[PDB]
């Protein structure tokens, strides 16, 4: 059967000068039943990744409008296509951008999550060029809606290929929805960038450039892995203070440095003999911080892990060439290199330990008694409340906005 539900439609890219009102609306959509190995999923909540706002601005979607937004969220399996294996109706799942076939040479390497068989669905469509999402326009015509990539989370019901899904309910039966939501992107990204990609060991020094939800997740990982030194860099004093409270040892307000002192110079001055850090994480989306993160790393030895995204002129980023040749080591990172079968189960177990749960609670501003987050909007309460919430994503103390989609 076809489900009618609420979803957040993006009519067109919000280009500079345009408002959220110009492009973002809560509408009724039609969600087709799942086919093949798909899950149709009753969404509990989505949470707002900075990449969700980039999507609203047209990021990676030159033609793929109108769409339903969102890649960060959690929900419950309502129904499955006839070929689906290893899932049941009622399982709680997240479905990030990359699957894990376990047989391709990338999977078999043991050192990456960039699966050759279950890669990013850049088409924002089913492989036959159709979509499980449609709506009736004010002209009465049935119109296609694009996904974000393989799915959209800013909807009461989504459909996703089960080769991208991983279940929460067996390991973490009591995990609240907003915590499941941040495990699907922001928290897996920051935690994994430190744990898996930079491979932080006890006694290592770490620099994190940008302490939004991703960078704070990285601080939580660095503290858990017993980093000797955790340096955070941002312009936002509220989030720097939150980073310090959750384990960071030194903070730098990049907008308060002297004009002649770069962020990388300030970071290196905190390290013995100005040698730099064992691990350098960028989690800002500021193209300048991608270059500064590369420079703050110990030449050759240290890895710089780039998680940041933004809308860059010619879709290009830059590095200072001499500092790059003489020991730069830079990797692109998607979802913290957290492989959905090999790594995610272990991350889920770790997320339930009390200090890690306390860190996720602080990111979210979660109240256990009411199951409310500090910044939360409900899709059932109208487009104006949503437009205000999306503006308030820029509020100094908004770390993670949660979009409630159904009763918990």
Ligand X SMILES: NC(=O)c1ccc[n+]([C@@H]2O[C@H](COP(=O)([O-])OP(=O)(O)OC[C@H]3O[C@@H](n4cnc5c(N)ncnc54)[C@H](O)[C@@H]3O)[C@@H](O)[C@H]2O)c1
Could you write out the DSSP letters of every residue in 231-256?
EEEES-HHHHHHHHHTT-SEEEEGGG
Q: Give the β-pairing of 402-404 and 376-378.
A: parallel
Among 49, 348, 351, 373, binds Zn ion (CB under 5 A): 49
Of 19-27, 230-238, 244-252, 345-353, the window that binds ligand X (rule: CB under 6 A) is: 230-238
204: Cα separation from own chain's centroid = 25
405 is an interface residue for Zn ion by CB under 5 A: no
Residue 408 C-beta: closest distance to ligand X, Å: 23
Residue 241 C-beta: closest distance to ligand X, Å: 12
Residue 151 annotated as part of some ligand binding site: no
Can you say whether residue 318 is alpha, beta or left, with left for phi > 0 and alpha for psi between -120 and 50 degrees?
beta
282 is an interface residue for a copy of itself by CB under 8 A: no
105 is an interface residue for a copy of itself by CB under 8 A: yes
Main-chain phi, psi angles of 263, to 5 degrees: -55, -40
Among 169, 265, 329, 352, binds a copy of itself (CB under 8 A): 329
Give how many residues touch Zn ion by CB under 5 A.
8
Of 60-68, 118-126, 196-204, 267-275, the window that binds Mg ion (rule: CB under 5 A) is: 118-126
Among 337, 338, 398, 401, binds a copy of itself (CB under 8 A): 337
Q: Report whether 166 contacts 86 (CB < 8 A).
A: no
Backbone CA torsion sign across 366, 69, 173, 378 = positive
Of 98-106, 273-281, 307-315, 371-379, the window that binds ligand X (rule: CB under 6 A) is: 307-315
Q: Which of residues 41-100 bind a copy of itself (CB under 8 A)?
A: 60
Give the E-state strand segments of 48-151 in sequence order.
Answer: 67-68, 73-80, 92-94, 133-136, 142-144
186: Cα separation from own chain's centroid = 3
Select from Mg ion, Zn ion, ligand X, none the partner in contact with residue 107, using the beta carbon and a kind-dependent cut-off of 5 to 8 Å.
Zn ion
211: Cα separation from own chain's centroid = 13
Among 78, 278, 292, 376, binds a copy of itself (CB under 8 A): 278
Among 29, 307, 343, 348, binds ligand X (CB under 6 A): 307
Question: Which tokens hold the place of 32?
Answer: 């087709």
d(CA 65, CA 31): 17
Residue 45 annotated as part of some ligand binding site: no
- Name the closest residue to ligand X (Cβ): 212
Comparing CB distances to a copy of itself, the nearer of 75 and 96 is: 96
58 is an interface residue for ligand X by CB under 6 A: no
Comparing CB distances to Mg ion, the nearer of 126 and 197 is: 126
Residue 342 C-beta: closest distance to Mg ion, Å: 23
Residue 49 DSSP SS3 = coil
64 is an interface residue for Zn ion by CB under 5 A: no
Select from ligand X, Mg ion, Zn ion, none the partner in contact with residue 161, using the beta carbon and a kind-dependent cut-off of 5 to 8 Å.
Mg ion
45: Cα separation from own chain's centroid = 14
309 is an interface residue for a copy of itself by CB under 8 A: yes
Length of the chain: 408
Residue 104 annotated as part of some ligand binding site: yes
d(CA 120, CA 164): 10
> Measuring CA to CA, which residue among 133, 113, 135, 111 is closest to residue 124?
133
Angle value at C-alpha 126, between 121 and 131, nearest 5 degrees = 120
334 is an interface residue for ligand X by CB under 6 A: yes
Backbone CA torsion sign across 58, 62, 67, 73 = negative
Select from ligand X, Mg ion, Zn ion, none the partner in contact with residue 104, using the beta carbon and a kind-dependent cut-off of 5 to 8 Å.
Zn ion
Of 22-30, 104-112, 152-160, 358-366, the window that binds Zn ion (rule: CB under 5 A) is: 104-112
Residue 376 DSSP SS3 = strand
Residue 251 annotated as part of some ligand binding site: no
184 is an interface residue for ligand X by CB under 6 A: no
Binding characters for ligand X, 281-300, by CB under 6 A (x = yes): --xxxx--------------
Q: For residue 66, is the peptide bond before it cis, meaning its omega torsion is within 30 degrees of 0?
A: yes
Residue 10 DSSP SS3 = strand
Comparing CB distances to ligand X, the nearer of 80 and 211 is: 211
Residue 373 annotated as part of some ligand binding site: no
The helix or strand, by DSSP H or E, that contains position 219, with its residue range, turns out to be helix 213-224
Among 161, 197, 282, 292, binds Mg ion (CB under 5 A): 161
Residues that bind Mg ion (CB under 5 A): 126, 161
Residue numbers at the binding site for Zn ion (CB under 5 A): 49, 51, 101, 104, 107, 115, 117, 185
């Amino acid at each position: 059967g076809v489900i009618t539900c609420k979803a957040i439609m993006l009519k067109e890219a919000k280009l500079p000068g345009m408002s959220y009102a110009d492009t973002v609306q809560i509408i009724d959509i039609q969600v087709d039943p799942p086919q093949n190995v798909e899950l149709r999923v009753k969404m509990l909540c989505a949470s707002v990744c900075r990449t969700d706002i980039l999507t609203i601005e047209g990021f990676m979607a030159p033609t793929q409008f109108p769409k339903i937004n969102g890649h960060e969220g959690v929900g419950i399996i309502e129904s499955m296509g006839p070929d689906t294996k290893n899932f049941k109706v009622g399982d709680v799942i997240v479905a990030p951008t990359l699957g894990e076939c376990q047989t391709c040479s990338s999977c078999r390497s043991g050192r990456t999550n960039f699966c050759q068989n279950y890669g990013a669905n850049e088409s924002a469509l089913e492989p036959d060029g159709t979509s499980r999402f449609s709506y009736i326009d004010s002209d009465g015509k049935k119109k296609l809606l694009y996904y974000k990539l393989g799915c959209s989370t800013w909807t009461q019901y989504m459909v996703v290929d089960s080769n991208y899904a991983t279940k929460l309910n067996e390991i973490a039966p009591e995990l609240p929805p907003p915590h499941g939501s941040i495990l699907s992107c922001a928290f897996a990204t920051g935690y994994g960038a430190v744990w898996l990609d930079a491979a932080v060991q006890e006694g290592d020094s770490v620099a994190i450039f940008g302490v939004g939800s991703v960078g704070i997740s990285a601080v939580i990982a660095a503290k858990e892995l017993k980093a000797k030194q955790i340096i955070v860099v941002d312009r936002n004093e509220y989030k720097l203070k939150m980073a310090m409270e959750l384990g960071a040892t030194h903070c730098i307000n990049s907008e308060k440095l002297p004009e002649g002192v770069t962020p990388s110079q300030a970071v290196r001055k905190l390290t013995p003999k100005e040698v730099g850090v064992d691990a350098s994480i960028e989690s800002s989306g500021y193209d300048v911080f991608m270059n500064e993160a590369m420079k703050a790393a110990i030449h050759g030895k240290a890895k710089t892990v780039i998680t940041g995204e933004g809308i860059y002129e010619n879709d290009r980023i830059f590095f200072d060439f001499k500092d790059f040749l003489f020991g730069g080591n830079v990797v692109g990172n998607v979802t913290g290199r957290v492989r959905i079968h090999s790594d995610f189960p272990g991350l889920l177990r770790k997320a339930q330990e009390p200090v890690i749960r306390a860190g996720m609670d602080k990111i979210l501003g979660y109240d256990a008694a009411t199951m409310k987050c500090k910044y939360e909007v409900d899709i059932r309460e109208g487009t104006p409340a949503l437009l205000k919430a999306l503006e308030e994503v820029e509020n100094v103390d908004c770390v993670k906005l949660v979009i409630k989609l159904n009763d918990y």
